[PDB]
Structure 1
Amino acid sequence: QEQGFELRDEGWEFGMSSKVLFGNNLDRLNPDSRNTLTKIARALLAVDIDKVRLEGHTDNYGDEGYNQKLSERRAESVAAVFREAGMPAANIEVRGLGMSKPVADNKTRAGRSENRRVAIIVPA
């Protein structure tokens, strides 16, 4: 039902700073991304979610095959953080989508930067 109206200021972890973005051709998480991820993982485990799908993505620069594999590496970097936060390994699905599903305009630096991402998906 509508119990969310009882919520006060605690635990709002899915805001604008919770996107998981990567540098050009990078597949490693920077210190603050690791932090966000640990906090997302903690938030999820705090609401009894311990199962996740991680979908990696690239911008459209370069070869499609190379980008498919880069997108997998990005999702893998995210998976490792979920495992170290205590999420069971078998409950983490990893998937690379390469360049095929952009969220933003690849013709700008800012848009390509929004496309280099891992989307955390929480299944039923």
Structure 2
Amino acid sequence: MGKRYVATPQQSQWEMVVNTPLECQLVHPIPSFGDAVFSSRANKKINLDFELKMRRPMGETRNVSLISMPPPWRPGEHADRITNLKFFKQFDGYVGGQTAWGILSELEKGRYPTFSYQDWQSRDQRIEVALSSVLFQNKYNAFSDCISNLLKYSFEDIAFTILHYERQGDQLTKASKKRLSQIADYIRHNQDIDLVLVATYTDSTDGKSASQSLSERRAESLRDYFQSLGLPEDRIQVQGYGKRRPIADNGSPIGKDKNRRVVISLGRTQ
């Protein structure tokens, strides 16, 4: 007959593979076919990716039909046509946007999301791939909890940061300390960040030697802080530019406060 790939109730299992404030990964192994992976990542926007990863790669680009088929143990219920996708050659199947959340929802109701398409490896015959809802509820609760505990900013949002200092003292302002805490959280949870560039520089109020001394003291304090997060010393770079290179009109009270600033630039190895 036809080839249907689904996990029987004795085989169906869901796992939370990545559970960190930077990524969530819920994986359902489809026996004899591959994996179904839901991934959510720390970001400012709602994002979910569903990837149907196949052991044998996609032979050709095919139109795929996504249906919400009821399980066998639900007589009298009809199937809902969800949508039509396109699975591309030598790529994992991808569903994103509202449809991935809809797949999760149809699994929450106890149904089977079924992808139907003509398989190139199977003499161009129609095959079905279903996601089992058996043992889904607890892992969906864990997935929702992890999504709740996701950072509301990505690497793009913090990779470049400019912080400001108070008029009198060596401490950062309140907002600058908050942004530094955000940077520290992202760094402490991300192991792929390799480079930190720190460029402190100050206002023209003090003398040139005094400006350089203040800038270097601030740079060394920030370098020690970045060391405290766990990065090795060979990765952090710190430089104090004193009162040179002003970005704002020195002399205005606001301009001097602008120039009293530090640049922090992160660099990752994805």
Q: TM-score, normalised by structure 2?
A: 0.38
Q: How does 1:106-117 map to 2 (within 5 A)?
A: 106-117=250-261
Q: Distance in 2 between matches of 1:30 and 1:50?
A: 27
2:226, 2:181 → 1: CA distance? 7
1:117, CA displacement in angstroms? Answer: 1.0
Partner of 1:63: 207
Q: Distance in 2 between matches of 1:64 and 1:71?
A: 10
Distance 2:194 2:168 in 1: 30
Deviation at 1:103, TM superposition (A): 1.4
Q: Judge which range, 30-39 or 59-68, deviates more.
A: 30-39
Q: CA RMSD in A?
A: 2.6
Shift >3 Å, 4+ stretches: 29-35
Identity rate of aligned residues, in percent? Answer: 33
Asked if the contact 1:25/1:70 (under 8 Å) is kept, the reply is: no
Q: Which has the higher contact order (CA 8 A, sep 6+)?
A: 1
Once the two structures are superposed, what CA deviation does each residue of 1:62-119 show, in whole Å capped at 9, x if it has no partner?
A: 2101101111111122222212222222211111101111111112111100111111
Hey, what's the Cα distance between the residues in 2 that align with 1:90 and 1:121? 16
User: Are 2:262 and 1:118 equivalent residues in the alignment?
Assistant: yes
Unmatched 5+ residue regions in structure 1? 1-6
Aligned to 1:52: 196
Aligned residues: 116
Residue pair 2:203, 2:256 contacting (<8 A) in 1 also:
yes
Question: Conserved in 1, the CA contact under 8 Å of 2:214 and 2:242?
Answer: yes
Out of 247, 252, 256, the position equivalent to 1:103 is 247
Q: Going by fraction, where is helix more abundant, 1 or 2? A: 1
Q: Which residue is 1:27 aligned to? A: 170
Paired letter, 1:24: R
Which structure's residues are more often strand, by fraction? Answer: 2
8 Å contact from structure 2 (residues 164, 173) kept in 1: no
Distance in 1 of aligned mates of 2:172 and 2:224: 10
In the alignment, the residues of structure 2 paired with residue 47 and residue 103 of structure 1 have an alpha-carbon distance, to the nearest angstrom, of 33
Kindly indicate whether the alpha-carbon contact (under 8 Å) linking 2:204 and 2:250 is maintained by their aligned counterparts in 1: yes
Distance 1:34 1:62, change over 3 A: closer
2:241 alignment partner AA: L
CA distance in 2, matches of 1:31, 1:86: 24
- Segments of structure 2 that go 5 or more residues without pairing to the other structure are 1-42, 47-151
